[model samples]
Target: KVYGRCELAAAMKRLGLDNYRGYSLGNWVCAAKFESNFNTHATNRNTDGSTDYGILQINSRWWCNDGRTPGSKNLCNIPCSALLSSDITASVNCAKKIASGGNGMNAWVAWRNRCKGTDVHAWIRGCR
Candidate 1:
């Protein structure tokens, strides 16, 4: 997965990430499983027809206030639609952002911590 030179690193720090890149595959899978059940194609509903798309539930169709399109660079670097793409890496990065420096991952960490290693279902459920 391709990440910006410092974006991923910064996000990792915010989450107090412990896993290496390799371990991240599974960890991210678990995180995704918690949030969207690993559904890359999932979208959240808004009564105004604002659909928050992707596993990270990024609402580019509704969230980008600067007038941008998917994959465009500048300002936020990550276009809003990256989360909805087929690329798993893009989805993870999107999660990292929503995780907002680390609270997102902290959410996961808290879940696991509270569950006492009981398969993390309770933790993952919040993401779902």
Candidate 2:
């Protein structure tokens, strides 16, 4: 899926995320890239009501009622095969929100905080 390219780029531009892109972009991209490519409709095979369907892979399967009751995954029926969509911004933003503890990161912090891990960047570039 080729989602969040523009939005990520724009968010990068806005937050100067580009400066740290080399350090973080890959990690951020890696987490949600393949399954949803940052799309909000991503889902898993679990039918036991255990699936995180949204950007950042908000695991409803794991998340408690606190995260599940506030919103409905049915806001839109985004296809698993889709790349970009109107919900892209909302979905990614939501992830950013959670990652940054609600207020969201400016850019640099988001890099170190969210995107650092084993071979995460390599996977992200592959997505591109």
Q: Please give the clash total of every predicted structure, in order.
A: 2, 1
Any idea what lDDT model 2 has? Answer: 0.44
lDDT of 1 by residue, 9-69 (tens): 3444345342432223334444454544556566666565455556655555434322434
TM-score of 2: 0.44
TM-score of each: 0.44, 0.44
Residue 90 lDDT, candidate 1, scale 0-100:
58
Which segments of candidate 1 are over 4 A away from where they belong? Answer: 1-27, 59-77, 97-102, 106-128
| Best candidate according to lDDT | 1
lDDT of each: 0.45, 0.44
* Candidate 1 residue-wise lDDT at 19: 49
Supply the global lDDT for candidate 1. 0.45
lDDT of 2 at 12: 35
